[PDB]
């Protein structure tokens, strides 16, 4: 019942920071078809828009 505030502090430190965004935005872009063919799963699939969860 107190972990959500810890996640909120994490997001405050990282989510909207411009340095973090410039480090992570548009980096390692993989298409859905390439993700499926290469054998990716989990977040590696769901980040490209594929709706799959075991």
């Amino acid at each position: 019942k107190n972990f959500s505030f810890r996640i909120d502090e994490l997001e405050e430190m990282l989510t909207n920071n411009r340095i973090w965004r410039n480090r992570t935005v548009d980096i390692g872009v993989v298409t859905a078809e390439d993700a499926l063919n290469y054998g990716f799963s989990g977040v590696m699939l769901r980040g490209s828009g594929i709706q799959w969860d075991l």
Partner: protein, 71 residues
């Protein structure tokens, strides 16, 4: 005799658990921030204008003293 006793939730369950993202918006418009910056810049400009004019007058006074002493 004794009844079953093991780790169970209390009757009525537990209280609600917050999980939604909560990043509040502190509050000040971009217009307000720009206006504050411009206002402090103008105040500093005016203060420095007055002080620099006074410094010019003081320098002229010192120069007059030196000129009087030169001969």
């Amino acid at each position: 005799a004794s009844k079953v006793k093991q780790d169970m939730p209390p009757p009525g369950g537990y209280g609600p658990i917050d999980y939604k993202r909560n990043l509040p918006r502190r509050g000040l418009s971009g217009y307000s921030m720009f206006a504050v910056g411009i206002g402090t810049l103008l105040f500093g400009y005016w203060s420095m204008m007055k002080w620099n004019r006074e410094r010019r007058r003081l320098q002229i006074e010192d120069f007059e003293a030196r000129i009087a002493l030169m001969p």
